[PDB]
Amino acid sequence: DRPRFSFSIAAREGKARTGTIEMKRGVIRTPAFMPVGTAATVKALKPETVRATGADIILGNTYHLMLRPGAERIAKLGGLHSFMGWDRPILTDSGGYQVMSLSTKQSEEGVTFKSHLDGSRHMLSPERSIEIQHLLGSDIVMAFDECTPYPATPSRAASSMERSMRWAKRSRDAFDSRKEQAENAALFGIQQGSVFENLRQQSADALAEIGFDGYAVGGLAVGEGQDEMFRVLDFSVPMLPDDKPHYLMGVGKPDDIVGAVERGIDMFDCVGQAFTWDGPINIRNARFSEDLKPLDSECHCAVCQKWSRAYIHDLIRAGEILGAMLMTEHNIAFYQQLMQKIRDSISEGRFSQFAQDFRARYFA
Amino acid sequence: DRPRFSFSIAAREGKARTGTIEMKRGVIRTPAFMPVGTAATVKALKPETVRATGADIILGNTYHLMLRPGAERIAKLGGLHSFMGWDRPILTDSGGYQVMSLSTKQSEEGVTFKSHLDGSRHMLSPERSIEIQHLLGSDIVMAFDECTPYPATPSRAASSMERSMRWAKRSRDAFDSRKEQAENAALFGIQQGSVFENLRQQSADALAEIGFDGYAVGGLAVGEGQDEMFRVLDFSVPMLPDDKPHYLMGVGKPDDIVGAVERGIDMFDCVGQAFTWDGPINIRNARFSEDLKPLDSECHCAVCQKWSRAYIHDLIRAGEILGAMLMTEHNIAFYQQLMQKIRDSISEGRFSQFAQDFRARYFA
Ligand SMILES: [Zn+2]
Ligand SMILES: [Zn+2]
């Protein structure tokens, strides 16, 4: 019988690590990329299709799910695994980021907001967020925090980091209050502090004192640019407990991922562009109209086995759902192949060379 | 090696027949229902999915294909079978019906029209329609005719029937002029004549004198209502050659199909509604919101194995493409199961009883 949660590091190179997270619903190979299963084109894909790319775990957006069709409904009707037809681990976010980006009255208690769909009124808080994630039945639950915009003044960055740490303790206690959740799921805390080294340190200290199963670096991929993001990761990741997973939320492009692994990150997610080893292409571009090759000539995915650039170009320009599904399937597969190459190269002690080789070709 | 075209009747009951059409690309069991493969939700389905429902042949709409991405492009790039990923027979229509319904200047030579997509100018004629269908590479080619609206005066019905027969001879000669098409594909002629028995007779006589591989009953499912349609089929079908397939274009609902088979028809096509043995339901209706049963409790399809009415209700109301795909897959599967029950009951000499039993439950 598998444990509730066990993270084992099998190999290291510099700050990079490769390993496994064992959970009751399955094993997650790290570094891991989590497709966002609650995307329309993603759910249009068979769960089997998503699994066949190599995904070990997918993400669900709590904000979208609570709004449509609702958490209590998902629960009464079987839970999110049944809803997604996905029997392996699922990570849910707290819902708070989409409140800020898509929907508000904020207070120390939580946030109230109006649905972007029907103007109905809704509430999130550390306690309600954890409750909804319990109702969904997810395996990895994110603490509910308060986002900091970029740029942010030091005073604001500090206030939102401090509130986030208070809310991290509330999230921990809410999670621990439900037997079924505490015994079967895992809880991740989120470090805040914007670009400020001392705030990041205070945040890491607070989260480690509370204790979580894994630690996300929050507050990045919000406008800062890759150099700044990498600079913040350089000092922030080593502040987190070494023996637990490190999750960079909302990152990102292939080169972001590679640089973030070089800095100690273990888990990633993000939502006409197709990825190739020679860089992204926009398939709508007229230069692909007579291009008979697949999206990427080394890609092993089912799309690249069967369909040309020329055909996918036509579908996407015509706005056909087949086009969007084919692009999404290939892109998910490309990301899983990237993660596999990363894991192999770290295990084999040649990840530095891999990162160099990857960049040379991807930016050529 | 399979013949270009062979229709064999294995069993009869009254005017109903069951049998097979053998073509180079495969066997078609009759009575047959042809899904329209050029539909967005239909093409979003795997070809394997469509095949797994039992479909032996699919239809392509020449009007849509010539407009986007174009016949010459489909040809240069591999042909419609490659384009659809479907290696079994494909029937294409002539394109003329959608010109009348979607796009005009008509003459004895053919029609010119403006694309409903970009205002570009296009032309169809018996010769150009046959040429485009050759470029697509379809297995069953429809003669290009002139549609008669409903209702139509006798004079108009006669003029359009007579023009259609002239155009049937032109279609025959164009088809016969291309070796690759004549040796490998089949050509169907279309009977016209509206609701008038004498015009239908003249039309059947003209088409039989020219000679085709199969004969469609045209000009129905255009507003007349089922009783009138059935009345026209009662006298029209027996006018056609008995030893060749009879195709009712654009029909239709399950009960239309059953009554049309009782009158001698062998082939059908048509484009929130789900079909069940207990009649159609609209899954969006609030009464299905807590309904945990599948769309139909006897249906063998992959959708009904896995998904509830309650869930599909949510998807369709939210406008999710997964919803439309699940509904389409189940509906295609339902139609193939209907056709299978029809074929079995005719072979077994109990089709009359089947039709009675079907109607009793479907309209209960
Ligand atoms: Zn691919
Ligand atoms: Zn079904």
XYZ file of C-alpha atoms and ligand atoms in Angstrom:
730
model
C 0.000 0.000 0.000
C 1.338 3.395 -1.022
C 1.937 6.091 1.609
C -0.093 9.301 1.793
C 3.055 11.211 0.772
C 6.705 10.341 0.323
C 9.224 12.408 -1.621
C 12.452 10.606 -2.387
C 15.406 12.210 -4.145
C 17.198 9.675 -6.372
C 19.897 11.923 -7.866
C 21.285 15.459 -7.759
C 23.427 17.706 -9.916
C 24.147 21.135 -8.493
C 20.839 22.429 -7.207
C 18.897 20.183 -9.594
C 17.181 17.071 -8.239
C 15.289 14.125 -9.703
C 13.093 11.777 -7.734
C 9.581 10.594 -7.031
C 6.587 11.618 -4.974
C 4.652 8.543 -3.874
C 0.956 9.099 -3.093
C -2.006 6.781 -2.617
C -3.195 7.391 -6.185
C 0.186 6.987 -7.869
C 3.801 7.958 -8.292
C 4.881 11.334 -9.640
C 8.231 11.523 -11.343
C 10.124 14.789 -10.633
C 10.879 17.216 -12.064
C 7.216 17.033 -13.122
C 5.052 19.101 -15.438
C 1.317 19.163 -14.614
C -1.094 19.826 -17.469
C -4.103 21.882 -16.453
C -6.887 19.331 -16.743
C -9.650 21.869 -16.307
C -8.869 23.471 -19.666
C -11.520 22.949 -22.331
C -9.132 21.619 -24.968
C -7.335 19.578 -22.321
C -10.554 17.918 -21.094
C -11.632 17.387 -24.714
C -8.693 15.018 -24.818
C -9.192 11.506 -23.463
C -7.702 11.049 -19.979
C -5.916 8.134 -21.613
C -4.474 10.552 -24.133
C -3.150 12.826 -21.395
C -1.728 9.827 -19.527
C -0.103 8.464 -22.689
C 2.002 11.633 -23.007
C 3.609 10.735 -19.708
C 1.699 13.039 -17.350
C 1.695 11.643 -13.788
C -0.548 14.266 -12.219
C -2.802 17.039 -13.518
C -3.949 20.356 -12.075
C -7.501 21.514 -11.428
C -8.449 25.224 -11.058
C -10.579 25.563 -7.942
C -11.908 28.981 -9.024
C -13.368 27.605 -12.231
C -14.703 24.439 -10.628
C -16.408 26.276 -7.737
C -18.146 28.535 -10.219
C -19.184 25.854 -12.686
C -20.503 23.335 -11.859
C -19.778 23.924 -8.164
C -17.816 22.051 -5.566
C -20.745 20.551 -3.679
C -22.139 19.229 -6.981
C -18.824 17.645 -8.019
C -18.702 16.026 -4.533
C -22.283 14.725 -4.386
C -21.701 13.305 -7.849
C -18.463 11.382 -7.255
C -15.577 13.789 -6.822
C -13.143 15.454 -9.174
C -11.333 12.231 -10.150
C -14.570 10.760 -11.381
C -15.456 14.095 -13.052
C -12.127 14.209 -14.892
C -11.984 10.459 -15.545
C -8.436 10.668 -14.146
C -7.559 8.152 -11.444
C -4.024 9.373 -10.678
C -3.022 12.312 -8.428
C -4.634 15.724 -8.957
C -3.284 19.002 -7.521
C -5.795 21.790 -6.969
C -4.864 25.458 -6.565
C -6.496 27.532 -3.869
C -8.713 29.609 -6.173
C -7.297 32.876 -4.917
C -5.199 33.815 -7.955
C -8.163 33.643 -10.359
C -10.267 35.694 -7.996
C -7.674 38.452 -8.418
C -7.272 37.904 -12.179
C -10.815 37.013 -13.357
C -13.575 38.114 -10.950
C -13.892 42.000 -4.950
C -13.650 42.902 -1.258
C -10.503 41.717 0.572
C -10.076 41.490 4.336
C -8.079 39.596 6.915
C -10.852 36.969 6.846
C -10.670 36.248 3.097
C -12.245 37.620 -0.075
C -15.763 38.044 -1.456
C -16.231 38.364 -5.197
C -18.718 38.275 -8.045
C -18.676 35.414 -10.563
C -17.367 36.483 -13.994
C -20.155 34.312 -15.433
C -23.413 35.364 -13.759
C -22.658 38.056 -11.171
C -23.494 35.693 -8.299
C -21.563 36.342 -5.079
C -18.858 34.002 -3.722
C -16.386 33.813 -0.856
C -12.974 32.268 -0.344
C -10.832 32.161 2.778
C -8.213 29.748 4.015
C -10.979 27.640 5.615
C -13.364 27.727 2.660
C -10.644 27.122 0.118
C -9.436 24.022 1.995
C -13.063 22.860 2.347
C -13.732 23.179 -1.382
C -10.533 21.313 -2.199
C -11.691 18.574 0.189
C -15.047 18.439 -1.587
C -13.233 18.096 -4.897
C -11.157 15.308 -3.390
C -7.772 16.422 -4.688
C -4.553 14.787 -3.609
C -2.386 17.897 -3.354
C -4.073 20.897 -1.771
C -2.621 24.430 -2.010
C -2.795 26.795 0.974
C -4.843 29.936 0.336
C -2.706 33.081 0.211
C -2.788 36.740 -0.841
C -1.105 37.644 -4.125
C 1.307 40.527 -4.509
C 1.264 42.459 -7.793
C 4.451 43.283 -9.652
C 6.005 45.612 -9.093
C 5.167 45.992 -5.392
C 6.610 48.361 -2.827
C 8.497 46.749 0.031
C 5.715 47.734 2.450
C 3.038 46.101 0.326
C 5.164 43.023 -0.385
C 5.704 42.640 3.350
C 2.040 43.121 4.300
C 0.853 40.550 1.758
C 3.610 38.096 2.664
C 2.706 38.438 6.376
C -0.992 37.963 5.673
C -0.141 34.974 3.493
C 1.771 33.392 6.391
C -1.144 33.919 8.791
C -3.377 32.375 6.147
C -0.855 29.495 5.732
C -1.311 28.604 9.391
C -5.104 28.814 8.986
C -4.859 26.597 5.902
C -2.767 24.065 7.808
C -5.229 23.945 10.697
C -8.282 23.662 8.421
C -6.639 20.797 6.499
C -5.675 19.032 9.722
C -9.272 19.334 11.029
C -10.669 16.840 8.511
C -9.600 13.254 9.057
C -10.244 12.129 5.490
C -8.180 14.934 4.073
C -5.351 14.836 6.626
C -4.871 11.046 6.185
C -5.128 10.833 2.383
C -4.079 14.177 0.814
C -1.018 16.468 1.075
C -0.828 20.237 1.724
C 1.660 22.656 0.140
C 2.521 26.085 1.537
C 3.443 29.046 -0.694
C 6.445 31.331 -0.135
C 5.823 35.060 -0.846
C 7.955 38.165 -0.494
C 8.115 39.489 -4.100
C 11.718 40.271 -5.167
C 12.957 40.997 -1.638
C 15.458 38.547 -0.179
C 14.653 39.306 3.497
C 10.884 38.868 2.999
C 11.458 35.611 1.101
C 13.571 34.451 4.031
C 10.949 35.382 6.613
C 8.335 33.616 4.482
C 10.375 30.399 4.177
C 11.029 30.458 7.952
C 7.306 30.837 8.750
C 6.255 28.073 6.382
C 8.922 25.652 7.660
C 7.870 26.330 11.255
C 4.238 25.518 10.381
C 5.416 22.534 8.266
C 4.017 21.486 4.881
C 4.394 18.508 2.527
C 5.852 20.724 -0.175
C 6.663 24.368 -0.798
C 5.740 26.549 -3.718
C 7.578 29.628 -4.784
C 4.758 32.111 -5.254
C 4.633 35.583 -6.708
C 6.622 34.947 -9.878
C 5.593 34.769 -13.547
C 3.619 37.954 -12.938
C 5.489 40.332 -15.226
C 9.044 40.366 -13.919
C 10.891 38.870 -16.916
C 13.102 35.749 -16.922
C 16.318 37.342 -15.652
C 14.536 38.736 -12.586
C 12.637 35.511 -12.027
C 15.887 33.518 -12.161
C 17.552 36.048 -9.820
C 14.754 35.626 -7.271
C 14.905 31.818 -7.549
C 18.704 31.916 -7.015
C 18.248 33.058 -3.392
C 14.667 31.899 -2.686
C 14.762 28.147 -3.390
C 17.642 27.356 -1.056
C 15.604 28.916 1.783
C 12.990 26.173 1.473
C 13.367 22.749 3.132
C 15.654 20.691 0.912
C 13.894 17.378 1.568
C 10.455 18.425 0.258
C 9.236 19.264 -3.275
C 9.643 22.787 -4.600
C 6.822 23.964 -6.892
C 7.092 26.990 -9.203
C 3.500 28.000 -9.830
C 2.503 29.112 -13.338
C 5.866 28.528 -15.039
C 6.166 28.239 -17.879
C 7.961 28.201 -21.262
C 10.461 25.330 -21.889
C 13.491 27.551 -21.233
C 11.943 28.851 -17.990
C 11.495 25.267 -16.881
C 15.060 24.271 -17.665
C 16.511 27.265 -15.811
C 14.129 26.732 -12.884
C 15.247 23.072 -12.537
C 18.895 24.305 -12.489
C 17.813 26.391 -9.495
C 16.138 23.582 -7.510
C 12.515 23.479 -8.692
C 10.726 20.055 -8.869
C 7.204 20.826 -10.116
C 5.671 23.069 -12.775
C 2.346 23.913 -14.345
C 1.120 26.335 -16.925
C -1.617 26.965 -19.499
C -1.317 28.695 -32.921
C 1.913 28.242 -30.954
C 3.613 24.811 -31.144
C 6.776 23.843 -29.241
C 9.669 22.269 -31.089
C 13.244 21.514 -30.091
C 14.196 24.344 -32.457
C 11.984 26.824 -30.604
C 8.268 27.678 -30.727
C 6.599 28.177 -34.121
C 3.249 29.771 -34.928
C 1.567 27.260 -37.160
C -0.765 29.882 -38.591
C 2.169 31.576 -40.315
C 1.969 31.369 -44.104
C 5.471 29.799 -44.234
C 3.928 26.544 -42.964
C 1.184 26.294 -45.606
C 3.023 23.751 -47.781
C 5.183 22.272 -44.990
C 4.531 18.531 -45.019
C 6.675 17.681 -41.963
C 5.039 17.177 -38.550
C 5.101 19.887 -35.893
C 8.425 18.513 -34.640
C 10.400 15.882 -36.526
C 11.711 14.187 -33.364
C 8.467 14.273 -31.367
C 7.006 10.844 -30.602
C 3.406 12.029 -30.066
C 0.360 10.632 -31.882
C -0.219 13.963 -33.585
C 3.267 14.027 -35.096
C 2.899 10.412 -36.243
C -0.096 11.301 -38.397
C -0.546 15.023 -39.184
C 1.455 17.624 -41.133
C 2.170 21.271 -40.362
C 0.235 22.154 -43.550
C -2.942 20.475 -42.293
C -2.813 21.804 -38.736
C -2.182 25.299 -40.224
C -5.491 25.004 -42.102
C -7.447 23.785 -39.093
C -6.210 26.487 -36.757
C -6.763 29.287 -39.296
C -10.305 27.968 -39.818
C -10.932 27.874 -36.071
C -11.627 24.126 -36.034
C -11.646 22.420 -32.676
C -9.743 19.479 -34.170
C -6.870 21.943 -34.729
C -6.791 23.180 -31.138
C -6.965 19.590 -29.855
C -4.119 18.412 -32.075
C -1.953 21.394 -31.024
C -2.728 20.850 -27.349
C -1.999 17.125 -27.484
C 1.341 17.722 -29.205
C 2.291 20.559 -26.802
C 1.487 18.466 -23.710
C 3.517 15.629 -25.191
C 6.440 17.940 -25.955
C 6.477 19.190 -22.351
C 6.460 15.602 -20.998
C 9.329 14.675 -23.307
C 11.247 17.737 -22.029
C 10.628 16.634 -18.426
C 11.778 13.104 -19.266
C 15.002 14.421 -20.826
C 15.550 16.538 -17.746
C 15.011 13.617 -15.376
C 17.301 11.338 -17.343
C 20.067 13.897 -17.634
C 20.049 14.638 -13.902
C 20.053 10.935 -13.023
C 22.997 10.486 -15.413
C 24.921 13.527 -14.141
C 24.843 15.388 -17.443
C 22.037 17.911 -16.845
C 24.359 20.919 -17.174
C 25.342 19.713 -20.636
C 21.722 19.007 -21.472
C 20.687 22.560 -20.467
C 23.474 24.003 -22.596
C 22.607 21.843 -25.607
C 18.906 22.535 -25.204
C 19.412 26.320 -25.185
C 21.835 26.313 -28.090
C 19.260 24.638 -30.346
C 16.056 26.143 -28.960
C 17.365 29.683 -29.428
C 19.164 28.997 -32.704
C -9.294 -8.082 -54.965
C -12.557 -6.245 -54.387
C -14.607 -4.998 -57.352
C -15.117 -1.309 -58.122
C -18.804 -1.752 -57.224
C -21.053 -4.690 -56.453
C -24.413 -4.473 -54.702
C -25.756 -7.791 -53.502
C -29.139 -8.229 -51.843
C -28.995 -10.955 -49.170
C -32.584 -10.785 -47.882
C -35.914 -9.042 -48.436
C -39.114 -8.415 -46.522
C -41.795 -6.518 -48.397
C -40.034 -3.606 -50.039
C -37.236 -3.687 -47.455
C -33.848 -5.118 -48.425
C -30.587 -5.892 -46.646
C -27.291 -6.531 -48.362
C -23.812 -5.261 -49.072
C -22.075 -2.870 -51.418
C -18.558 -4.093 -52.154
C -16.053 -1.412 -53.209
C -12.274 -1.313 -53.498
C -11.955 0.440 -50.129
C -14.366 -1.791 -48.222
C -17.773 -3.328 -47.751
C -20.845 -1.291 -46.863
C -23.615 -3.054 -45.025
C -27.125 -1.928 -46.108
C -29.343 -0.382 -45.015
C -26.488 1.998 -44.143
C -26.296 5.288 -42.281
C -23.441 7.618 -43.308
C -22.185 10.092 -40.719
C -21.158 13.423 -42.192
C -17.406 13.345 -41.678
C -16.910 16.964 -42.637
C -18.722 18.162 -39.516
C -16.508 19.874 -36.952
C -17.617 17.729 -34.020
C -17.529 14.647 -36.232
C -13.936 15.293 -37.373
C -12.970 16.126 -33.779
C -13.692 12.470 -33.164
C -10.974 9.956 -34.008
C -11.626 8.136 -37.299
C -11.201 5.041 -35.155
C -13.996 6.300 -32.947
C -16.322 6.747 -35.915
C -15.372 3.303 -37.237
C -15.907 1.704 -33.824
C -19.572 2.772 -33.866
C -20.039 0.574 -36.901
C -19.937 3.183 -39.676
C -18.840 1.609 -42.987
C -18.733 4.789 -45.047
C -18.871 8.514 -44.300
C -20.054 11.529 -46.279
C -18.054 14.590 -47.285
C -19.701 17.928 -48.252
C -18.124 19.093 -51.496
C -19.370 22.674 -51.007
C -17.546 23.059 -47.716
C -14.400 21.304 -48.902
C -14.124 23.352 -52.122
C -14.390 26.535 -50.102
C -12.006 25.558 -47.325
C -9.331 24.395 -47.840
C -10.061 23.822 -51.535
C -10.209 20.767 -53.716
C -6.906 21.248 -55.516
C -5.172 21.644 -52.136
C -6.737 18.474 -50.695
C -5.596 16.663 -53.890
C -2.019 17.972 -54.038
C -1.737 17.046 -50.375
C -2.936 13.429 -50.500
C -6.665 13.311 -51.127
C -9.723 13.342 -48.919
C -9.080 9.903 -47.377
C -5.731 11.067 -46.121
C -7.295 14.388 -45.015
C -10.008 12.602 -43.032
C -7.738 9.793 -41.823
C -10.503 7.457 -43.042
C -9.403 4.603 -45.289
C -12.845 3.128 -46.033
C -15.379 4.354 -48.636
C -16.376 8.031 -48.708
C -19.440 9.408 -50.539
C -19.290 13.036 -51.635
C -22.341 15.128 -52.528
C -22.285 17.335 -55.586
C -22.057 20.664 -53.741
C -25.173 22.017 -55.389
C -27.544 21.821 -52.414
C -25.304 23.957 -50.176
C -24.891 26.501 -52.929
C -28.669 26.963 -52.780
C -28.827 26.851 -48.963
C -25.615 28.640 -47.861
C -24.087 30.886 -50.552
C -26.021 33.116 -57.071
C -26.585 33.088 -60.837
C -28.123 29.901 -62.296
C -28.097 28.896 -65.956
C -28.259 25.806 -68.112
C -24.455 25.632 -67.806
C -24.334 25.530 -63.987
C -24.190 28.045 -61.144
C -21.854 30.834 -60.036
C -21.908 31.931 -56.415
C -20.109 33.889 -53.725
C -18.435 32.089 -50.812
C -20.310 32.558 -47.511
C -16.863 32.938 -45.921
C -14.964 35.578 -47.908
C -17.132 36.727 -50.822
C -14.815 35.066 -53.353
C -16.530 33.831 -56.523
C -17.013 30.131 -57.367
C -18.621 27.972 -60.035
C -20.200 24.539 -60.124
C -21.595 22.615 -63.074
C -21.972 18.934 -63.794
C -18.416 18.897 -65.213
C -16.814 20.937 -62.438
C -18.638 19.108 -59.689
C -17.460 15.725 -61.017
C -13.925 17.138 -61.390
C -13.824 18.361 -57.792
C -15.107 15.021 -56.533
C -12.329 13.358 -58.548
C -9.779 15.682 -56.957
C -11.122 14.747 -53.539
C -10.828 11.095 -54.500
C -14.199 9.943 -53.199
C -15.542 6.482 -53.845
C -19.185 7.382 -54.441
C -19.745 10.484 -56.540
C -23.141 12.235 -56.750
C -24.369 13.679 -60.057
C -24.865 17.450 -60.005
C -28.528 18.452 -60.232
C -30.880 21.406 -59.740
C -32.926 21.488 -56.540
C -36.643 22.155 -56.457
C -38.035 24.119 -53.504
C -41.099 22.961 -51.617
C -43.754 23.624 -52.429
C -43.157 23.900 -56.186
C -45.644 24.366 -58.991
C -45.889 21.517 -61.471
C -44.269 23.689 -64.158
C -41.291 24.504 -61.964
C -40.968 20.931 -60.689
C -40.930 19.740 -64.291
C -38.392 22.321 -65.500
C -35.970 21.534 -62.673
C -36.443 17.782 -63.054
C -35.770 18.070 -66.819
C -32.682 20.200 -66.256
C -31.525 17.733 -63.613
C -31.806 14.884 -66.136
C -29.791 16.801 -68.743
C -27.237 17.473 -66.025
C -27.328 13.749 -65.050
C -26.207 12.831 -68.556
C -23.470 15.492 -68.394
C -22.397 14.129 -65.007
C -22.258 10.598 -66.398
C -20.144 11.665 -69.368
C -17.758 13.757 -67.245
C -17.271 10.835 -64.832
C -16.693 8.411 -67.700
C -14.072 10.761 -69.232
C -11.537 10.163 -66.451
C -10.013 6.703 -66.401
C -8.991 6.803 -62.746
C -12.451 7.788 -61.651
C -14.407 5.514 -64.002
C -12.355 2.426 -62.979
C -12.229 2.997 -59.206
C -15.270 5.062 -58.096
C -19.066 4.771 -58.527
C -21.604 7.380 -59.717
C -25.147 7.828 -58.376
C -27.937 9.639 -60.217
C -30.669 11.597 -58.403
C -34.401 11.295 -59.130
C -36.368 14.599 -59.016
C -39.975 15.504 -59.708
C -41.147 16.930 -56.335
C -44.457 15.353 -55.201
C -45.678 14.576 -58.725
C -45.928 10.910 -59.666
C -45.602 11.453 -63.452
C -42.471 13.626 -63.101
C -40.915 11.094 -60.712
C -41.619 8.428 -63.318
C -40.078 10.432 -66.149
C -37.063 11.107 -63.926
C -36.563 7.424 -63.035
C -36.894 6.488 -66.736
C -34.254 9.052 -67.784
C -31.801 8.005 -65.092
C -32.206 4.282 -65.849
C -31.644 4.934 -69.557
C -28.398 6.794 -68.772
C -27.490 4.110 -66.176
C -25.932 4.728 -62.755
C -24.430 2.600 -59.968
C -27.118 3.725 -57.549
C -30.118 6.029 -57.430
C -30.978 8.693 -54.921
C -34.422 9.978 -54.225
C -33.896 13.727 -54.284
C -36.117 16.628 -53.371
C -37.398 15.341 -50.037
C -36.699 16.415 -46.444
C -37.211 19.986 -47.626
C -40.294 20.905 -45.618
C -42.956 18.447 -46.719
C -43.566 16.579 -43.437
C -43.243 12.814 -42.847
C -46.652 11.749 -44.162
C -46.024 13.488 -47.493
C -42.467 12.208 -47.671
C -43.670 8.639 -47.064
C -46.442 9.117 -49.661
C -43.896 10.224 -52.268
C -41.574 7.311 -51.420
C -44.506 4.858 -51.754
C -44.695 5.471 -55.526
C -41.179 6.804 -56.247
C -38.873 4.032 -54.990
C -40.433 1.236 -57.019
C -39.728 3.298 -60.165
C -35.984 2.970 -59.596
C -33.974 -0.088 -60.705
C -34.515 -2.775 -58.082
C -31.003 -4.226 -58.334
C -29.125 -1.030 -57.384
C -28.928 0.910 -54.086
C -31.581 3.487 -53.278
C -30.312 6.527 -51.344
C -32.593 8.968 -49.497
C -30.538 12.132 -49.224
C -30.685 14.130 -45.980
C -32.968 11.778 -44.030
C -33.165 11.789 -41.166
C -34.695 11.106 -37.722
C -34.787 7.434 -36.540
C -38.494 7.052 -37.352
C -37.974 8.543 -40.832
C -35.262 5.978 -41.419
C -37.383 3.051 -40.303
C -40.318 4.087 -42.498
C -37.997 4.787 -45.440
C -36.473 1.269 -45.178
C -40.049 -0.163 -45.209
C -40.403 1.655 -48.534
C -37.207 0.332 -50.169
C -34.441 2.763 -49.184
C -30.880 1.373 -48.599
C -28.757 4.406 -47.675
C -29.178 7.471 -45.466
C -27.271 10.479 -44.222
C -28.037 13.470 -42.101
C -26.495 16.086 -39.803
C -28.572 19.184 -26.790
C -30.637 16.472 -28.488
C -29.734 12.831 -27.699
C -31.419 9.784 -29.262
C -32.713 7.014 -27.045
C -34.901 3.996 -27.723
C -37.579 5.857 -25.754
C -37.388 8.868 -28.073
C -35.109 11.921 -28.282
C -34.343 13.875 -25.096
C -32.858 17.348 -24.718
C -30.080 16.879 -22.234
C -30.067 20.561 -21.337
C -33.491 20.198 -19.726
C -33.413 20.734 -15.966
C -35.080 17.320 -15.412
C -31.737 15.682 -16.267
C -29.626 17.655 -13.772
C -29.510 14.885 -11.146
C -30.052 11.969 -13.564
C -27.147 9.586 -13.016
C -28.069 7.114 -15.790
C -26.309 7.284 -19.175
C -27.957 8.882 -22.198
C -29.539 5.523 -23.049
C -29.454 2.558 -20.689
C -29.190 -0.028 -23.487
C -26.661 1.830 -25.649
C -23.296 0.084 -25.975
C -21.284 3.213 -26.878
C -18.159 4.397 -25.043
C -19.955 7.521 -23.887
C -22.739 5.548 -22.215
C -20.193 3.243 -20.565
C -18.598 6.159 -18.734
C -20.695 9.359 -18.535
C -24.004 10.311 -16.886
C -26.856 12.472 -18.150
C -26.123 14.854 -15.239
C -22.549 15.455 -16.405
C -23.309 15.840 -20.107
C -26.123 18.278 -19.122
C -23.511 20.466 -17.405
C -21.069 20.365 -20.302
C -23.626 21.249 -22.942
C -25.147 24.083 -20.880
C -21.624 25.452 -20.363
C -20.879 25.230 -24.083
C -17.934 22.859 -23.601
C -16.636 21.093 -26.665
C -16.275 17.883 -24.649
C -20.085 17.963 -24.306
C -20.745 18.307 -28.031
C -18.230 15.536 -28.774
C -19.764 13.148 -26.252
C -23.280 13.834 -27.614
C -22.137 13.380 -31.205
C -20.301 10.135 -30.479
C -23.328 8.687 -28.685
C -25.749 9.847 -31.427
C -23.619 8.335 -34.213
C -23.421 5.119 -32.219
C -27.182 5.083 -31.648
C -27.818 5.463 -35.390
C -25.420 2.581 -36.194
C -27.137 0.380 -33.620
C -30.503 1.251 -35.232
C -29.124 0.288 -38.659
C -27.773 -2.977 -37.244
C -31.166 -3.834 -35.722
C -32.780 -3.055 -39.048
C -30.358 -5.252 -40.984
C -30.744 -8.145 -38.578
C -34.519 -7.963 -38.520
C -34.779 -7.950 -42.316
C -32.348 -10.861 -42.634
C -34.435 -12.740 -40.046
C -37.793 -11.887 -41.649
C -39.113 -9.950 -38.668
C -38.564 -6.338 -39.787
C -42.292 -5.527 -39.781
C -42.454 -6.552 -36.131
C -39.283 -4.626 -35.398
C -40.727 -1.442 -36.974
C -43.899 -1.839 -34.934
C -42.010 -2.454 -31.687
C -39.611 0.390 -32.391
C -42.434 2.901 -32.944
C -44.437 1.766 -29.942
C -41.517 2.503 -27.606
C -39.966 5.490 -29.373
C -43.270 7.373 -29.365
C -44.380 6.185 -25.930
Zn 4.192 15.945 -31.483
Zn -24.483 5.855 -26.016
